[PDB]
Amino acid sequence: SHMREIIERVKEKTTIPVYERTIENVLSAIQASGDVWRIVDLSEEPLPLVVAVVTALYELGYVAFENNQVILTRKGKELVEKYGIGPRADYTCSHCQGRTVEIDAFSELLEQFKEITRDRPEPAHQFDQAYVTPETTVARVALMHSRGDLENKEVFVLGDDDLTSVALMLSGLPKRIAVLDIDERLTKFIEKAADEIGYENIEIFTFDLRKPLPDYALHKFDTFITDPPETVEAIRAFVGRGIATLKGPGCAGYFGITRRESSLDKWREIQRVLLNEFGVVITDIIRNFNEYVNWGYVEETRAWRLLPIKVKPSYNWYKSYMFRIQTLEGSKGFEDEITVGQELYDDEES
Amino acid sequence: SHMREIIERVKEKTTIPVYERTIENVLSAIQASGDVWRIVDLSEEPLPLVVAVVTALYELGYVAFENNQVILTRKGKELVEKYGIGPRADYTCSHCQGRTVEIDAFSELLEQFKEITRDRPEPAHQFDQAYVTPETTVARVALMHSRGDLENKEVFVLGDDDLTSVALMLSGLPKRIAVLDIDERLTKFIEKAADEIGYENIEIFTFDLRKPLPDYALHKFDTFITDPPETVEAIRAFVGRGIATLKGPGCAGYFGITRRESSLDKWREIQRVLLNEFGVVITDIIRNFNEYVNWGYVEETRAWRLLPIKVKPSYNWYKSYMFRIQTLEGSKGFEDEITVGQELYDDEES
Ligand SMILES: [Fe+3]
């Protein structure tokens, strides 16, 4: 009863749920790659859970670390063989990078975005607070336009590390754009890009999000976009605040949810929030739509700290799914005070 | 108050919910195409609802029918300018048709599936009883394998007009495949294909789906795939039964849901069944992944019957979204006897 032993070992190391499928996913990934960052990517299990699993595996003799790779031992090869776990294949589409949309027609926008963002603020120095690639940004415009959520729409951008607002301005599509960010380096940069483009229908909000929305944000938008912190409670706050900015039925929201930091037991809870507390409908969930830029900022992670391989990731391993929602009769957002501080941003899953 | 008048007119014609966004979707579609089947495709509103809308628009002076095309009158154009409604754009990826998966690595499977099915049972002559293209079918295999849900897995195929089991047999991936279908022309053909391929791990079930699952199907599979009829009650039944065939947490379901026949209010109800009745998580929702073959079998539709345009579709206009779900701790299917009748394949959404 090999698998049962592995499961119990991993459970000693985390409170995140552990299933056989968990082990299997990791095992499958390992056979495809020895790179820890890719293992996390391919397994689509949360980072701390992969670290727990890999640790449990090593402890029990199933894996080794050799020439800086994570690898199956003789005993490991027997294990995957016994359970019929093959290496994880992938067929992500090479032109759209799995995004479902192609950006050929936004070639000029892409280029103008890369140029204008030459000296954008540098990212915060954590792997999970990076901004998305330019291609992601432009692919988001493409998506949102193709669903009819941009042209002559009033669009609210809640947090804009990504500089989605800049893209939106270069698109010429919206009627107006509001951005909420207290990062004054961001909002200043956004202003400058606006002045440079001559775009007049942009506004900067700086209210406290923990506080009820002001009357100039409440029910005043057609579409919002946000990237919430990966906790249920932050998703409720950020997405629910986004929903509360919407006018009424027929409006759209876009946001990112990761497999890197949120287990599928957490995803279930997030989905029940959206469908029961808010009463909206999820119209799209697109795997790895969002690709985050990698600067090697992983040195605080347990993966870096406590595992013997100390190789930085060599590609944009950190990706999130695009969720699209739409409002309907009886939909609602989250309008209460957000009464938890920095604890909003972490949970039991690290 | 133009818009409010149109909404009222449309509500006289249907019990499906009607929003300003509904009208907008349609109007947006009309400016992109005059082909009624394309209008339904681009608007992503259900067929009868689009009919209602077009009819209302026509009655109120905003649309006309000319050269077999649905077009805007002068008064219509003034309507869309006033409300800022532009033509619907689309950026679906050319290479993968939006599926997120490319099938170049499956060129041999594709060729073999087309050859082996040259003489397949001809479709039922209902636009919505069609089977999917070969490319759809191969793209499903790629998708399901990329998530680790095929290789040495036991796969339950509930209804198989699409002949997925045949693709799956040619792929060589699963440990075993069971198909439930009472259309003996199909199951016979599946047997013929299995014998021709030499595949021995295929089984045909024919039990009554309304009756509780037998002990040889209950909790015996790793993955199921089904295309349910589109009513809340039928998705509860078909998807729920598929879930009751799975072993436990960590198992996968794949099925199709359309925008053609199910309003987004309906999708909300559907996802509440999945998240609250079954306790499953939706890991992917990919628009138009499934493309159905068109043979012009639309003569029963209101669209055909009552509009002055009488052109048959010139392309594969009928498409559904791919949902993937995964089981988790506390997940459950639908194990009860179904007492409701054919009443299950019919809803007020026509
Ligand atoms: Fe593609």
Q: Cα A140 to chain center, whole Å?
A: 13
CA distance B301 to B126: 10
- Domain shared by A290 and A311, yes or no: yes
Between the alpha carbon of residue A309 and those of residues A10, A54, A261, B15, the distances in Å are: 20, 12, 21, 62
Query: Do A294 and A127 form a contact (C-beta atoms < 8 A)?
Result: yes
Residue A261 lies in a domain: yes
A328 contacts B100? CB cut-off 8 A = no
- Domain shared by A49 and A128, yes or no: no
Burial class (CB in 10 A: 0-12, 13-18, 19+), B305: exposed
Distance from the Cα of B343 to chain A's closest Cα (Å) equals 26
Tokens representing B36 are 């009624």
CA distance A96 to A113: 18
Between the alpha carbon of residue B152 and those of residues A4, A27, B155, B204, the distances in Å are: 20, 14, 9, 19
Query: Do B10 and B23 form a contact (C-beta atoms < 8 A)?
Result: yes
CA distance B106 to B68: 40
Chain A residues with beta carbon closer than 8 angstroms to that of B265: 281, 328-329
- Please name the residues in contact with A28: beta carbons below 8 A apart, sequence gap of 6 or more: A42, A43, A85, A86, A87, A88, B148
Chain A residues with beta carbon closer than 8 angstroms to that of B249: 19, 21
Nearest to A247 by CA among A126, A180, A156, A157: A156
- Domain shared by B62 and B105, yes or no: no
- Domain shared by A267 and A121, yes or no: yes
Query: Do B250 and A7 form a contact (C-beta atoms < 8 A)?
Result: no
- Domain shared by A21 and A166, yes or no: no
Resolution in A: 1.9
Provide the domain limits for residue A44: 3-85
Residue A278 lies in a domain: yes
CA distance A338 to A318: 28
Pick the residue from chain B with its C-alpha nearest to A104: B91
Residue A338 lies in a domain: no
Distance A101 CA to ligand 1 centre (A): 7
Residues written for chain A: 350
Query: Do A260 and A47 form a contact (C-beta atoms < 8 A)?
Result: yes
Exposure of A50 in the CB half-sphere (CA atoms within 13 A): 29
Nearest to B296 by CA among B53, B123, B83: B123
B101 contacts A96? CB cut-off 8 A = no
Q: Would residue A219 be called left, alpha or beta, if left means φ above 0 and alpha means ψ between -120 and 50 degrees?
A: left
Query: Do A62 and A72 form a contact (C-beta atoms < 8 A)?
Result: yes
Nearest to B245 by CA among B151, B333, B141: B333
**CB environment A317-348: b (16+ within 10 A), e (fewer):** bbbbbbbbbbbbeebebbeeebeeeeebeebe
Q: Please compute Rg for chain A using Cα positions.
A: 21
Greatest CA span in chain A, whole angstroms? Answer: 68
Strand partners, B71: B64
Partner residue opposite A152 with nearest CB, options B86, B92, B142: B86
Partner residue opposite A19 with nearest CB, options B90, B249, B268: B249
Residue A40 lies in a domain: yes
DSSP state of B105: G
Residues written for chain B: 350
A88 contacts B101? CB cut-off 8 A = no
Between the alpha carbon of residue B316 and those of residues A130, B51, B260, B297, B298, the distances in Å are: 41, 19, 13, 12, 12
Give the position of tokens 């006897």. Answer: B337
- Domain shared by B72 and B101, yes or no: no
- Domain shared by A15 and A109, yes or no: no
A275 contacts B275? CB cut-off 8 A = yes
- Please name the residues in contact with A4: beta carbons below 8 A apart, sequence gap of 6 or more: none
Residue B92 lies in a domain: no
> CATH no. for residue A200?
3.40.50.150
Residue B71 lies in a domain: yes
A21 contacts B152? CB cut-off 8 A = no
Residue B253 lies in a domain: yes
Tokens representing B48 are 């009868």
CA distance A179 to A156: 6
B285 contacts A328? CB cut-off 8 A = no
> CATH no. for residue B14?
1.10.10.10
A283 contacts B91? CB cut-off 8 A = no
Distance B33 CA to ligand 1 centre (A): 24
Chain B residues with beta carbon closer than 8 angstroms to that of A93: 93, 95-96, 99-102
- Domain shared by A152 and A204, yes or no: yes
- Domain shared by A56 and A106, yes or no: no
Query: Do B141 and B106 form a contact (C-beta atoms < 8 A)?
Result: yes
Query: Do A158 and A140 form a contact (C-beta atoms < 8 A)?
Result: no
Tokens representing A168 are 């939106």
Other beta carbons within 10 angstroms of residue A287's beta carbon come to 23
Strand partners, A253: A224, A325
Distance A94 CA to ligand 1 centre (A): 6
- Domain final residue pick, B85, B118, B142: B85
Nearest to B190 by CA among B216, B213, B209, B170: B170
User: Which of A110, A257, A287, A324 to probe by mutation at the B interface, max B CB count within 10 Å?
Assistant: A287
A91 contacts B146? CB cut-off 8 A = yes
Between the alpha carbon of residue A44 and those of residues A224, A260, A263, A286, B246, the distances in Å are: 27, 7, 9, 14, 21
Partner residue opposite A102 with nearest CB, options B93, B250, B267: B93
Tokens representing A307 are 């595992």
Chain A residues with beta carbon closer than 8 angstroms to that of B49: none
Nearest to B147 by CA among A100, A232, A264: A264
- Domain shared by A229 and A295, yes or no: yes
CA distance A249 to A254: 15
- Domain final residue pick, A85, A112, A145: A85
Strand partners, B70: B65
- Domain shared by B252 and B107, yes or no: yes
- Domain final residue pick, B25, B51, B85: B85
Chain B residues with beta carbon closer than 8 angstroms to that of A103: 91
Burial class (CB in 10 A: 0-12, 13-18, 19+), A73: middle
Query: Do B254 and B225 form a contact (C-beta atoms < 8 A)?
Result: yes
Chain A residues with beta carbon closer than 8 angstroms to that of B146: 88-92
Tokens representing B1 are 């108050």
CA distance B327 to B333: 10
CA distance B135 to B106: 10
Tokens representing A214 are 């002001």
B102 contacts A268? CB cut-off 8 A = no
Residue B290 lies in a domain: yes
Give how many domains chain A has, as a whole number.
2
Distance from the Cα of A283 to chain B's closest Cα (Å) equals 7
A148 contacts B28? CB cut-off 8 A = yes
Q: Cα B158 to chain center, whole Å?
A: 14
Element housing B28 (H / E): helix B20-32
- Please name the residues in contact with A34: beta carbons below 8 A apart, sequence gap of 6 or more: A68, A69, A70, A71
- Domain shared by A159 and A250, yes or no: yes
Chain B residues with beta carbon closer than 8 angstroms to that of A264: 281, 283, 326, 328
Query: Do B139 and B94 form a contact (C-beta atoms < 8 A)?
Result: no
CA distance A345 to B17: 38
CA distance B350 to B263: 11
Distance from the Cα of A58 to chain B's closest Cα (Å) equals 23
3-state secondary structure chain A: CHHHHHHHHHHHCCCCCCCHHHHHHHHHHHHHCCCHHHHHHHHCCCHHHHHHHHHHHHHCCCEEEECCEEEECHHHHHHHHHHCCCCCCCCECCCCCCCCECCHHHHHHHHHHHHHCCCCCCCCCCHHHCCECHHHHHHHHHHHHHCCCCCCCEEEEECCCCCHHHHHHHHCCCCEEEEECCCHHHHHHHHHHHHHHCCCCEEEECCCCCCCCCCCCCCCECEEEECCCCCHHHHHHHHHHHHHHECCCCCEEEEEEECCCCCHHHHHHHHHHHHHHCCCEEEEEEEEEEEECCCCCCCCCHHHHHCCCCCCCCCCCCEEEEEEEECCCCCCCCCCCCCCCHHHHCCCCC
